[PDB]
Amino acid sequence: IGTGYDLSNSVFSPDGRNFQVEYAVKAVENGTTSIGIKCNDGVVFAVEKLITSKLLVPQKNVKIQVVDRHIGCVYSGLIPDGRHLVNRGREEAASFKKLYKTPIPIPAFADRLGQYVQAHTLYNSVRPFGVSTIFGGVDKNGAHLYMLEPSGSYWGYKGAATGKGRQSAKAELEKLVDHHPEGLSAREAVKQAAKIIYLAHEDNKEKDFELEISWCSLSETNGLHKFVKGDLLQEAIDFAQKEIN
Amino acid sequence: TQQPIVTGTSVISMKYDNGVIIAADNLGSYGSLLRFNGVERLIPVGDNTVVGISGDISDMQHIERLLKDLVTENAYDNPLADAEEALEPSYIFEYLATVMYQRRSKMNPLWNAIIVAGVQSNGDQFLRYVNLLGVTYSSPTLATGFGAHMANPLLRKVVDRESDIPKTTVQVAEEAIVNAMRVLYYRDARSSRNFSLAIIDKNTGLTFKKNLQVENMKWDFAKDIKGYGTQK
């Protein structure tokens, strides 16, 4: 905005903002669309993985990564910075597993991640994170879905979005709530997750994308995380192709 | 320098043509006191291996946690892991061989006798020993603790060498491990009647049989023993 305050992630402007922290959300916009759909018995993750040319090996590139085995994460923004955060998430989970002999609760997982990101906006020789993480899963407290911003800030969400196609995404997500006050059970939410990424792509109608859907479902995976793969995925593709035309 | 506080005794195992048997009594003996009942030695790891652990139950628990994190480790950063870089018995064994030694070198020995039995995804029978002296060896038949002295000869009839593997079948091998158990039940103090027996096959998959009871019971010869040596 003004001169100064930018350069180091510890300096305040007059306004009560810190330009570096602001600059970190801006960076995620250029990244590739991510959504989360929370459900009464599951969570669904979907992501837009852009293919630069027909040279890419299909289905062999993912931004969906696992933590412990019951927590999904998918990131938008800068890919490798995003990896780093998920690495650390594994460390968080693993440490909890040793001590207490149980899988992390989702609010426990959100707390420790939220601090690690906050630390890296606290010092002068650190850099602010450049990634958002829509993340969540299912635990002994039911389903939860969170979205972690680059500031060190998070909140719960019934349906969440970040990335390039996030205005198309949030708009639809809101629609999802009105039509479904019951919030959609996990099966139909796979197919539906597909249709949102297909819409989000009318602002990303440049190059092709690969639809990768994963889930973690109480009713249909036994509270564990697994990818949606094979014929289940195909059905979700065919529905999305139909309803976009 | 740890000493065993509570201990499991005896895991027996053998090779057969299409896979392996690992078996052990279920007991956590607190020395002379038979303290804990229902303690389970055999932990499935991946789905193509059972690792059995005897020795300190205190060290066992710790090894169980490391084993669970190895499964979790394989999932992490792999698009799939159920046949891509699927977890073999051999990988598990090597991960364990290294840590028992590393700890031995720091003079806080994980006080265990461990048998890793499994089948590879290459069709190869795997059955190997590690212990708390960090000694390793591969052998067609194995047994630990009391059971090394006692029950392992008996299995060595069934398979002496590695060219009688194709002439031994799954019903016959199963029969031999249970007669081996019977004998551990009779003639070993830290052996319970309770036992678990797991068959990992490369074709049948994992069968884990829990809470079997020793049978073919001989005690009816006991009324003819009168006195210690001289007594009418």
Coordinates of N, CA and C in Angstrom, one line a residue, chain B:
Chain B
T1 N 20.5 -50.0 32.6 CA 20.6 -51.4 32.0 C 19.4 -52.1 32.6
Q2 N 18.4 -52.3 31.7 CA 17.1 -52.9 31.9 C 17.5 -54.3 32.2
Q3 N 16.5 -54.9 32.9 CA 16.4 -56.3 33.2 C 15.0 -56.7 32.8
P4 N 14.6 -57.8 32.4 CA 13.2 -58.3 32.2 C 12.4 -58.2 33.5
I5 N 11.2 -57.6 33.5 CA 10.4 -57.5 34.6 C 9.3 -58.5 34.4
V6 N 8.5 -58.4 33.3 CA 7.4 -59.4 33.0 C 7.9 -60.0 31.7
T7 N 7.7 -61.4 31.4 CA 8.2 -61.9 30.1 C 7.3 -63.0 29.5
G8 N 7.2 -62.9 28.2 CA 6.7 -63.9 27.3 C 7.8 -64.9 27.1
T9 N 7.5 -66.1 26.9 CA 8.4 -67.3 26.6 C 7.8 -68.1 25.5
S10 N 8.7 -68.4 24.5 CA 8.5 -69.3 23.4 C 7.6 -68.7 22.3
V11 N 8.1 -68.6 21.1 CA 7.4 -68.5 19.8 C 8.1 -69.5 19.0
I12 N 7.3 -70.3 18.3 CA 7.7 -71.5 17.5 C 7.2 -71.1 16.2
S13 N 7.9 -71.5 15.1 CA 7.6 -71.2 13.7 C 8.3 -72.2 12.8
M14 N 7.8 -72.4 11.6 CA 8.4 -73.4 10.7 C 8.0 -72.9 9.3
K15 N 8.7 -73.4 8.2 CA 8.4 -73.2 6.8 C 7.6 -74.3 6.3
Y16 N 6.7 -74.1 5.4 CA 6.0 -75.1 4.6 C 5.9 -74.5 3.2
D17 N 5.4 -75.3 2.3 CA 5.5 -75.0 0.8 C 4.9 -73.7 0.3
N18 N 3.7 -73.3 0.8 CA 3.0 -72.1 0.3 C 3.0 -71.1 1.4
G19 N 3.5 -71.3 2.6 CA 3.7 -70.2 3.4 C 4.3 -70.6 4.8
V20 N 4.0 -69.9 5.9 CA 4.6 -70.1 7.2 C 3.6 -70.1 8.3
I21 N 4.0 -70.7 9.5 CA 3.2 -70.7 10.7 C 4.1 -70.1 11.8
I22 N 3.5 -69.2 12.6 CA 4.1 -68.6 13.7 C 3.1 -68.8 14.9
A23 N 3.5 -69.1 16.1 CA 2.5 -69.5 17.1 C 3.3 -69.3 18.4
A24 N 2.6 -69.1 19.5 CA 3.1 -68.8 20.8 C 2.0 -68.8 21.7
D25 N 2.3 -69.2 23.0 CA 1.4 -69.1 24.1 C 1.2 -67.6 24.5
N26 N 0.0 -67.5 25.2 CA -0.4 -66.1 25.5 C -0.3 -66.1 27.0
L27 N 0.7 -65.3 27.5 CA 1.0 -65.2 28.9 C 2.0 -64.1 29.1
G28 N 1.9 -63.3 30.2 CA 2.8 -62.3 30.6 C 3.2 -62.8 32.0
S29 N 4.3 -63.6 32.1 CA 4.6 -64.2 33.4 C 5.5 -63.2 34.2
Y30 N 5.1 -62.9 35.4 CA 5.8 -62.0 36.3 C 6.7 -62.8 37.1
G31 N 7.7 -63.4 36.5 CA 8.6 -64.4 37.2 C 7.8 -65.7 37.5
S32 N 7.9 -66.2 38.7 CA 7.2 -67.3 39.3 C 5.6 -67.2 39.4
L33 N 5.2 -65.9 39.4 CA 3.8 -65.6 39.5 C 3.4 -65.6 38.0
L34 N 2.2 -66.2 37.5 CA 1.6 -66.2 36.2 C 0.7 -65.1 36.3
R35 N 1.2 -63.8 35.9 CA 0.6 -62.6 36.3 C -0.6 -62.2 35.4
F36 N -0.4 -62.4 34.1 CA -1.3 -61.7 33.2 C -1.6 -62.7 32.2
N37 N -2.9 -62.7 31.9 CA -3.6 -63.6 31.1 C -4.3 -62.9 30.0
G38 N -4.1 -63.4 28.7 CA -4.7 -62.8 27.5 C -3.8 -61.9 26.9
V39 N -2.4 -61.9 27.3 CA -1.4 -61.0 26.7 C -1.2 -61.6 25.3
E40 N -1.1 -60.8 24.2 CA -1.1 -61.2 22.9 C 0.2 -60.8 22.3
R41 N 1.0 -61.8 22.0 CA 2.4 -61.7 21.5 C 2.6 -61.3 19.9
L42 N 1.6 -61.8 19.3 CA 1.5 -61.8 17.8 C 0.7 -60.7 17.3
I43 N 1.4 -59.8 16.5 CA 0.9 -58.6 16.1 C 0.9 -58.6 14.6
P44 N -0.2 -58.4 13.9 CA -0.1 -58.4 12.5 C 0.4 -57.0 12.1
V45 N 1.3 -56.9 11.1 CA 1.9 -55.8 10.6 C 1.9 -55.9 9.1
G46 N 1.5 -54.8 8.4 CA 1.0 -54.9 7.1 C -0.2 -55.8 7.0
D47 N 0.0 -57.1 6.4 CA -1.2 -58.0 6.3 C -0.5 -59.3 5.7
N48 N 0.9 -59.2 5.5 CA 1.6 -60.3 4.8 C 2.6 -60.8 5.8
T49 N 2.5 -60.3 7.1 CA 3.6 -60.6 8.1 C 2.8 -60.6 9.4
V50 N 3.2 -61.6 10.3 CA 2.9 -61.5 11.7 C 4.3 -61.5 12.3
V51 N 4.6 -60.4 13.2 CA 5.7 -60.4 14.1 C 5.2 -60.8 15.5
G52 N 5.9 -61.8 15.9 CA 5.8 -62.3 17.2 C 7.0 -61.9 18.0
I53 N 6.7 -61.6 19.2 CA 7.7 -60.9 20.1 C 7.5 -61.7 21.5
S54 N 8.6 -62.2 22.0 CA 8.6 -62.8 23.4 C 9.6 -61.9 24.1
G55 N 9.9 -62.2 25.4 CA 10.8 -61.4 26.2 C 9.8 -60.3 26.9
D56 N 10.5 -59.3 27.5 CA 10.0 -58.2 28.3 C 8.8 -57.7 27.7
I57 N 7.6 -57.7 28.4 CA 6.4 -57.2 27.9 C 6.5 -55.7 27.8
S58 N 7.4 -55.1 28.7 CA 7.7 -53.8 28.7 C 8.3 -53.2 27.5
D59 N 9.3 -54.0 27.0 CA 9.9 -53.7 25.7 C 9.0 -54.0 24.5
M60 N 8.1 -55.0 24.8 CA 7.2 -55.5 23.6 C 6.4 -54.3 23.2
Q61 N 5.8 -53.6 24.1 CA 4.8 -52.6 23.9 C 5.3 -51.5 23.0
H62 N 6.6 -51.2 23.3 CA 7.4 -50.2 22.7 C 7.7 -50.5 21.2
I63 N 8.1 -51.8 21.0 CA 8.2 -52.4 19.7 C 6.9 -52.4 19.0
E64 N 5.7 -52.6 19.6 CA 4.4 -52.6 19.0 C 4.1 -51.2 18.4
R65 N 4.6 -50.2 19.1 CA 4.3 -48.8 18.7 C 5.1 -48.5 17.5
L66 N 6.4 -48.9 17.5 CA 7.3 -48.7 16.4 C 6.8 -49.4 15.1
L67 N 6.2 -50.6 15.2 CA 5.7 -51.4 14.2 C 4.5 -50.8 13.5
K68 N 3.6 -50.1 14.4 CA 2.5 -49.4 13.8 C 2.7 -48.1 13.0
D69 N 3.8 -47.4 13.5 CA 4.3 -46.3 12.8 C 5.0 -46.7 11.5
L70 N 5.5 -48.0 11.3 CA 6.1 -48.4 10.0 C 5.1 -48.6 9.0
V71 N 3.8 -49.0 9.4 CA 2.7 -49.2 8.5 C 2.2 -47.9 8.0
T72 N 2.2 -46.9 8.9 CA 1.7 -45.6 8.7 C 2.8 -44.9 7.9
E73 N 4.0 -45.3 8.1 CA 5.1 -44.7 7.3 C 5.1 -45.0 5.8
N74 N 4.7 -46.2 5.5 CA 4.5 -46.7 4.1 C 3.3 -46.0 3.4
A75 N 2.2 -45.7 4.1 CA 1.1 -44.9 3.5 C 1.5 -43.5 3.0
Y76 N 2.2 -42.8 3.8 CA 2.7 -41.4 3.7 C 3.5 -41.3 2.4
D77 N 3.1 -40.4 1.5 CA 3.8 -40.0 0.3 C 3.8 -41.0 -0.9
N78 N 2.9 -41.9 -0.8 CA 2.8 -43.0 -1.8 C 1.4 -42.9 -2.3
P79 N 1.2 -42.9 -3.7 CA -0.1 -42.9 -4.2 C -0.9 -44.1 -3.9
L80 N -0.3 -45.2 -3.6 CA -0.9 -46.4 -3.1 C 0.3 -47.1 -2.6
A81 N 0.1 -48.3 -1.9 CA 1.0 -48.9 -1.1 C 0.5 -50.3 -0.9
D82 N -0.6 -50.8 -1.5 CA -1.0 -52.1 -1.3 C -0.4 -53.0 -2.3
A83 N 0.5 -52.7 -3.3 CA 1.2 -53.6 -4.1 C 2.3 -52.7 -4.9
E84 N 2.3 -51.4 -4.6 CA 3.3 -50.6 -5.3 C 4.6 -50.7 -4.7
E85 N 4.7 -50.5 -3.3 CA 5.8 -50.5 -2.4 C 5.0 -50.9 -1.2
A86 N 4.6 -52.2 -1.4 CA 3.8 -52.9 -0.3 C 4.8 -53.4 0.6
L87 N 4.5 -53.5 1.9 CA 5.3 -53.8 3.1 C 5.5 -55.2 3.1
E88 N 6.8 -55.7 3.1 CA 7.2 -57.0 3.0 C 7.7 -57.4 4.4
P89 N 7.7 -58.7 4.8 CA 8.3 -59.1 6.0 C 9.8 -58.7 6.2
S90 N 10.5 -58.7 5.1 CA 11.9 -58.5 5.0 C 12.3 -57.1 5.4
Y91 N 11.5 -56.1 5.1 CA 11.7 -54.7 5.2 C 11.5 -54.4 6.7
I92 N 10.5 -55.0 7.3 CA 10.1 -54.9 8.7 C 11.3 -55.4 9.6
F93 N 11.8 -56.6 9.2 CA 12.9 -57.3 9.8 C 14.1 -56.5 9.9
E94 N 14.4 -55.7 8.8 CA 15.6 -55.0 8.6 C 15.5 -53.7 9.4
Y95 N 14.3 -53.1 9.5 CA 14.0 -52.0 10.3 C 14.1 -52.4 11.8
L96 N 13.7 -53.6 12.2 CA 14.0 -54.1 13.6 C 15.4 -54.5 13.9
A97 N 16.1 -55.1 13.0 CA 17.5 -55.5 13.1 C 18.4 -54.3 13.5
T98 N 18.1 -53.2 12.8 CA 18.9 -52.0 13.0 C 18.6 -51.3 14.4
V99 N 17.4 -51.4 14.9 CA 17.1 -50.6 16.1 C 17.6 -51.4 17.3
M100 N 17.4 -52.8 17.3 CA 17.8 -53.6 18.4 C 19.4 -53.5 18.6
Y101 N 20.2 -53.5 17.5 CA 21.6 -53.2 17.5 C 21.9 -51.8 18.0
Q102 N 21.2 -50.8 17.6 CA 21.5 -49.4 17.9 C 21.3 -49.1 19.4
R103 N 20.2 -49.9 19.9 CA 20.0 -49.8 21.3 C 21.0 -50.5 22.1
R104 N 21.5 -51.6 21.5 CA 22.5 -52.6 22.2 C 23.8 -51.8 22.5
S105 N 24.1 -50.9 21.4 CA 25.2 -50.0 21.4 C 25.2 -48.9 22.3
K106 N 24.0 -48.6 22.8 CA 23.8 -47.5 23.8 C 23.6 -48.2 25.2
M107 N 23.7 -49.6 25.3 CA 23.7 -50.3 26.5 C 22.3 -50.4 27.2
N108 N 21.2 -50.0 26.5 CA 19.8 -50.2 27.1 C 19.2 -51.1 26.1
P109 N 19.3 -52.5 26.3 CA 18.9 -53.5 25.3 C 17.4 -53.7 25.5
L110 N 16.8 -53.7 24.3 CA 15.4 -54.1 24.1 C 15.5 -55.6 24.4
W111 N 14.8 -56.1 25.5 CA 15.1 -57.4 26.0 C 14.1 -58.3 25.3
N112 N 14.4 -58.8 24.1 CA 13.3 -59.5 23.5 C 13.9 -60.7 22.7
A113 N 13.1 -61.7 22.3 CA 13.5 -62.6 21.3 C 12.4 -62.4 20.3
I114 N 12.7 -62.2 19.0 CA 11.7 -61.7 18.0 C 11.9 -62.7 16.8
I115 N 10.8 -63.2 16.2 CA 10.7 -63.9 15.0 C 9.8 -63.1 14.1
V116 N 10.3 -62.8 12.9 CA 9.5 -62.2 11.9 C 9.2 -63.4 10.9
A117 N 8.0 -63.7 10.6 CA 7.5 -64.6 9.7 C 6.5 -64.0 8.8
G118 N 6.7 -64.3 7.5 CA 5.8 -63.7 6.6 C 6.1 -64.5 5.3
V119 N 5.5 -63.9 4.3 CA 5.7 -64.2 2.9 C 6.0 -62.9 2.2
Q120 N 6.9 -62.9 1.2 CA 7.1 -61.7 0.3 C 6.2 -61.7 -0.7
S121 N 6.2 -60.6 -1.5 CA 5.3 -60.4 -2.7 C 6.0 -60.8 -3.9
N122 N 7.1 -61.6 -3.7 CA 7.9 -62.2 -4.7 C 7.8 -63.7 -4.6
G123 N 7.0 -64.2 -3.6 CA 6.7 -65.7 -3.6 C 7.6 -66.4 -2.7
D124 N 8.4 -65.7 -1.9 CA 9.6 -66.2 -1.2 C 9.2 -66.3 0.2
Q125 N 9.4 -67.4 0.9 CA 9.1 -67.7 2.3 C 10.0 -66.9 3.1
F126 N 9.6 -66.2 4.2 CA 10.6 -65.4 4.9 C 10.5 -65.8 6.4
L127 N 11.7 -66.2 7.1 CA 11.5 -66.5 8.4 C 12.9 -66.4 9.0
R128 N 13.1 -65.5 10.1 CA 14.3 -65.0 10.5 C 14.2 -64.5 12.0
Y129 N 15.4 -64.4 12.7 CA 15.5 -64.3 14.1 C 16.3 -63.0 14.2
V130 N 15.9 -62.3 15.4 CA 16.7 -61.2 15.8 C 16.4 -61.3 17.3
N131 N 17.4 -60.8 18.1 CA 17.3 -60.8 19.5 C 18.0 -59.6 20.2
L132 N 18.2 -59.6 21.5 CA 18.7 -58.6 22.2 C 20.2 -58.5 22.4
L133 N 20.9 -59.5 21.8 CA 22.3 -59.5 21.6 C 22.6 -58.9 20.3
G134 N 21.5 -58.7 19.4 CA 21.4 -58.0 18.1 C 21.9 -59.0 17.1
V135 N 22.1 -60.3 17.4 CA 22.4 -61.5 16.6 C 21.3 -61.7 15.6
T136 N 21.6 -61.9 14.3 CA 20.6 -62.3 13.3 C 21.0 -63.5 12.6
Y137 N 20.0 -64.4 12.2 CA 20.3 -65.5 11.3 C 19.0 -65.9 10.7
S138 N 19.1 -66.5 9.5 CA 18.0 -67.0 8.8 C 18.0 -68.4 8.8
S139 N 16.8 -69.0 9.0 CA 16.9 -70.5 9.2 C 15.6 -71.0 8.8
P140 N 15.4 -72.2 8.4 CA 14.1 -72.6 7.9 C 13.2 -72.9 9.0
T141 N 13.7 -73.2 10.2 CA 12.8 -73.4 11.3 C 13.4 -72.6 12.4
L142 N 12.6 -71.9 13.2 CA 13.0 -71.1 14.4 C 12.3 -71.4 15.6
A143 N 12.9 -71.0 16.8 CA 12.2 -71.0 18.1 C 13.1 -70.2 19.0
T144 N 12.6 -69.5 20.0 CA 13.1 -68.7 20.9 C 13.0 -69.2 22.3
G145 N 13.9 -68.7 23.2 CA 13.8 -68.8 24.6 C 13.9 -70.3 25.1
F146 N 12.9 -70.7 25.9 CA 12.9 -72.1 26.4 C 12.7 -73.1 25.2
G147 N 11.9 -72.7 24.2 CA 11.4 -73.3 23.1 C 12.4 -73.7 22.1
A148 N 13.5 -73.0 22.2 CA 14.7 -73.3 21.3 C 15.3 -74.6 21.6
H149 N 15.4 -74.8 23.0 CA 16.0 -76.0 23.5 C 15.1 -77.1 23.3
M150 N 13.8 -76.8 23.5 CA 12.9 -77.9 23.8 C 12.2 -78.3 22.5
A151 N 11.4 -77.3 21.8 CA 10.5 -77.7 20.8 C 11.0 -77.7 19.4
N152 N 12.0 -76.9 19.2 CA 12.7 -76.7 17.8 C 13.2 -78.1 17.3
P153 N 14.0 -79.0 17.9 CA 14.2 -80.4 17.4 C 13.0 -81.1 16.9
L154 N 11.9 -80.9 17.5 CA 10.7 -81.7 17.1 C 10.3 -81.4 15.8
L155 N 10.3 -80.1 15.4 CA 10.0 -79.5 14.1 C 11.0 -79.8 13.1
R156 N 12.2 -80.2 13.6 CA 13.3 -80.4 12.7 C 13.3 -81.8 12.1
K157 N 12.5 -82.7 12.6 CA 12.0 -83.8 11.9 C 11.2 -83.5 10.7
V158 N 10.2 -82.6 10.9 CA 9.3 -82.2 9.9 C 9.9 -81.6 8.7
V159 N 10.9 -80.7 9.0 CA 11.7 -80.1 8.0 C 13.2 -80.1 8.4
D160 N 14.1 -80.9 7.9 CA 15.4 -80.7 8.3 C 16.1 -79.6 7.5
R161 N 15.9 -79.5 6.2 CA 16.7 -78.8 5.2 C 15.8 -78.3 4.2
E162 N 16.4 -77.5 3.3 CA 15.4 -76.7 2.5 C 14.9 -77.3 1.2
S163 N 15.1 -78.7 1.1 CA 14.6 -79.5 0.0 C 13.5 -80.4 0.4
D164 N 12.9 -80.3 1.7 CA 11.8 -81.0 2.2 C 10.7 -80.1 2.4
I165 N 10.8 -78.7 2.1 CA 9.8 -77.8 2.0 C 8.8 -78.2 1.0
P166 N 8.9 -78.6 -0.2 CA 7.8 -78.9 -1.1 C 7.1 -80.1 -0.8
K167 N 7.6 -81.0 0.2 CA 6.9 -82.2 0.5 C 6.2 -82.1 1.8
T168 N 6.1 -80.9 2.4 CA 5.4 -80.6 3.6 C 4.2 -79.7 3.2
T169 N 3.0 -80.1 3.7 CA 1.8 -79.3 3.4 C 1.2 -78.7 4.6
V170 N 0.3 -77.8 4.4 CA -0.3 -76.9 5.4 C -1.1 -77.6 6.5
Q171 N -1.8 -78.8 6.3 CA -2.5 -79.5 7.3 C -1.4 -80.1 8.2
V172 N -0.3 -80.7 7.6 CA 0.8 -81.4 8.3 C 1.6 -80.4 9.1
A173 N 1.9 -79.3 8.6 CA 2.7 -78.3 9.3 C 1.9 -77.9 10.5
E174 N 0.6 -77.6 10.3 CA -0.3 -77.1 11.4 C -0.4 -78.1 12.5
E175 N -0.4 -79.4 12.2 CA -0.4 -80.5 13.1 C 0.9 -80.5 14.0
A176 N 2.0 -80.3 13.4 CA 3.3 -80.2 14.0 C 3.5 -79.1 15.0
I177 N 3.0 -77.9 14.7 CA 3.1 -76.7 15.6 C 2.2 -77.1 16.8
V178 N 1.0 -77.6 16.7 CA 0.2 -77.9 17.8 C 0.7 -78.9 18.8
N179 N 1.3 -80.0 18.2 CA 2.0 -81.1 19.0 C 3.2 -80.4 19.7
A180 N 3.9 -79.4 19.0 CA 5.0 -78.6 19.6 C 4.5 -77.8 20.8
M181 N 3.3 -77.2 20.7 CA 2.6 -76.4 21.8 C 2.3 -77.3 23.1
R182 N 1.8 -78.5 22.8 CA 1.3 -79.5 23.8 C 2.5 -79.7 24.7
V183 N 3.7 -79.9 24.1 CA 4.9 -80.2 24.7 C 5.3 -79.0 25.6
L184 N 5.3 -77.7 25.1 CA 5.6 -76.5 25.8 C 4.7 -76.3 27.0
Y185 N 3.4 -76.7 26.8 CA 2.4 -76.7 27.9 C 2.7 -77.6 29.1
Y186 N 3.2 -78.8 28.8 CA 3.6 -79.8 29.8 C 4.8 -79.4 30.5
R187 N 5.8 -79.0 29.7 CA 7.2 -79.1 30.2 C 7.9 -77.8 30.3
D188 N 7.1 -76.7 30.5 CA 7.6 -75.4 30.6 C 6.6 -74.6 31.4
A189 N 7.1 -73.9 32.4 CA 6.4 -73.2 33.5 C 5.8 -72.0 33.2
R190 N 6.3 -71.3 32.2 CA 5.9 -70.0 31.7 C 5.3 -70.1 30.3
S191 N 4.5 -71.2 30.2 CA 3.7 -71.6 29.0 C 2.4 -71.9 29.5
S192 N 1.4 -71.2 28.9 CA 0.0 -71.4 29.2 C -0.7 -72.4 28.3
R193 N -1.9 -72.8 28.7 CA -2.7 -73.7 27.9 C -3.2 -72.9 26.7
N194 N -3.6 -71.6 27.0 CA -3.9 -70.6 26.0 C -2.8 -70.5 25.0
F195 N -3.2 -70.4 23.7 CA -2.2 -70.1 22.6 C -2.9 -69.5 21.4
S196 N -2.1 -68.7 20.5 CA -2.6 -68.2 19.3 C -1.7 -68.7 18.3
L197 N -2.2 -68.8 17.1 CA -1.5 -69.5 16.0 C -2.1 -68.7 14.8
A198 N -1.1 -68.2 14.0 CA -1.4 -67.4 12.8 C -0.7 -68.2 11.6
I199 N -1.4 -68.3 10.4 CA -0.9 -68.9 9.2 C -0.9 -67.8 8.3
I200 N 0.3 -67.4 7.7 CA 0.4 -66.3 6.6 C 0.7 -67.2 5.4
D201 N 0.0 -67.1 4.3 CA 0.1 -67.9 3.1 C 0.2 -66.9 2.1
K202 N 0.8 -67.2 0.9 CA 0.9 -66.2 -0.1 C -0.3 -66.2 -1.0
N203 N -1.2 -67.1 -0.7 CA -2.3 -67.4 -1.5 C -3.7 -67.3 -0.7
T204 N -3.6 -67.9 0.5 CA -4.7 -67.8 1.4 C -4.8 -66.5 2.2
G205 N -3.6 -65.9 2.4 CA -3.6 -64.6 3.0 C -3.4 -64.8 4.4
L206 N -3.9 -64.0 5.3 CA -3.6 -64.1 6.7 C -4.9 -64.8 7.3
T207 N -4.6 -65.8 8.1 CA -5.5 -66.4 9.0 C -4.8 -66.3 10.3
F208 N -5.6 -65.6 11.2 CA -5.2 -65.5 12.6 C -6.2 -66.2 13.4
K209 N -5.8 -67.3 14.1 CA -6.6 -68.1 14.9 C -6.2 -67.8 16.4
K210 N -7.2 -67.4 17.1 CA -7.0 -67.0 18.5 C -7.7 -68.0 19.4
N211 N -7.2 -68.1 20.7 CA -7.7 -68.9 21.8 C -8.0 -70.3 21.6
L212 N -6.9 -71.0 21.0 CA -7.0 -72.5 20.8 C -6.6 -73.1 22.1
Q213 N -6.9 -74.3 22.3 CA -6.6 -75.0 23.7 C -5.9 -76.2 23.3
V214 N -4.8 -76.6 24.2 CA -4.0 -77.7 24.0 C -5.0 -78.9 24.3
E215 N -4.9 -79.9 23.4 CA -5.6 -81.2 23.4 C -4.6 -82.3 23.1
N216 N -5.1 -83.5 23.1 CA -4.4 -84.8 23.2 C -3.6 -84.8 24.5
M217 N -4.4 -85.2 25.5 CA -4.1 -84.9 26.9 C -3.8 -86.2 27.5
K218 N -2.6 -86.2 28.2 CA -2.1 -87.5 28.8 C -1.8 -87.2 30.2
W219 N -2.6 -87.9 31.1 CA -2.5 -87.7 32.5 C -3.0 -89.0 33.1
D220 N -3.3 -90.0 32.2 CA -4.1 -91.1 32.7 C -3.1 -92.2 33.0
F221 N -1.8 -91.9 32.8 CA -0.7 -92.8 33.1 C -0.2 -92.5 34.5
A222 N -0.7 -91.4 35.1 CA -0.2 -90.8 36.4 C -0.5 -91.6 37.6
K223 N -1.6 -92.4 37.7 CA -2.0 -93.2 38.8 C -1.2 -94.4 39.0
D224 N -0.3 -94.7 38.1 CA 0.6 -95.9 38.2 C 1.9 -95.5 38.8
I225 N 2.2 -94.2 39.0 CA 3.3 -93.6 39.7 C 2.9 -93.5 41.1
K226 N 3.6 -94.2 41.9 CA 3.5 -94.4 43.4 C 4.8 -94.2 44.0
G227 N 4.9 -93.2 45.0 CA 6.2 -93.0 45.5 C 7.1 -92.2 44.6
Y228 N 8.3 -91.9 45.1 CA 9.3 -91.1 44.6 C 10.3 -92.0 43.9
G229 N 10.4 -93.3 44.4 CA 11.3 -94.2 43.9 C 11.1 -95.5 44.6
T230 N 10.9 -95.4 45.9 CA 10.7 -96.6 46.8 C 9.6 -96.1 47.7
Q231 N 8.5 -96.8 47.6 CA 7.3 -96.7 48.3 C 6.3 -97.7 47.7
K232 N 5.6 -98.4 48.6 CA 4.5 -99.3 48.1 C 3.2 -98.5 48.2

